[PDB]
Design a protein around this ligand. Structure first.
Ligand code: GTP
Ligand code: MG
Length: 169
């Protein structure tokens, strides 16, 4: 059994908890339970491999920003979540991406860009800008909805495959 330390990051209210709870409970929360820090240990089969996922569901509220350095040190890969239809000029994705690079003193930390809430009205330009951002950064982009489950397994499993690749290199 192979272990993977995944961390879900992003601004408050973007859907980190809803994505995690879709994966582990097969349920859409349809409720905002603002996070401090929750940690899950889950045995999941990915590509036929039995995986132990240690998933840290982190706080996006700015009042909890001091907790970031600790979870960035321990995390092996990061889901960087934003609301596709409210990308805020990528400001939060850029800050989390830089903080991860600085804390881990590494330019190639496993990372997936997750554009969540794609069930809500979304402009073509915002979907295309997200795809071009991910291409510029050399990381995958996955469009998700915690409401419909679109993309949820793809986001988490893509991050696990990137950690596999990083380890094999
Ligand atoms: N329509 C829709 N609502 C969503 C989706 N994901 C989350 N929500 C809702 O958005 C709100 C915030 O979701 P959470 O997952 O709690 O947000 P979070 O990113 O964990 O927030 P913090 O823990 O405070 O950082 C809740 O009311 C969710 O039901 C989604 O894909 N679509
Ligand atoms: Mg949360």
């Amino acid at each position: 059994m192979t272990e993977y330390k995944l961390v879900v990051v992003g601004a408050g209210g973007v859907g980190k908890s809803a994505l995690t709870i879709q994966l582990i409970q097969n349920h859409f929360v349809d409720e905002y339970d603002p996070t401090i820090e929750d940690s899950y240990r889950k045995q999941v089969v990915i590509d036929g491999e039995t995986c132990l996922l240690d998933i840290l569901d982190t706080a996006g509220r700015e009042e909890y920003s001091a907790m970031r350095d600790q979870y960035m040190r321990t995390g092996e890969g990061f889901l960087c979540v934003f609301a596709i239809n409210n990308s805020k000029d990528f400001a939060d994705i850029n800050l989390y991406r830089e903080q991860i690079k600085r804390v881990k003193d590494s330019d190639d930390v496993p990372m997936v860009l997750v554009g969540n809430k794609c069930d809500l009205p979304t402009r073509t330009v915002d979907t295309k800008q997200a795809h071009e951002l991910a291409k510029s950064y050399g990381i995958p982009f996955i469009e998700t909805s915690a409401k419909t489950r679109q993309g949820v397994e793809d986001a988490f499993y893509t991050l696990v495959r990137e950690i596999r690749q990083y380890r094999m290199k």
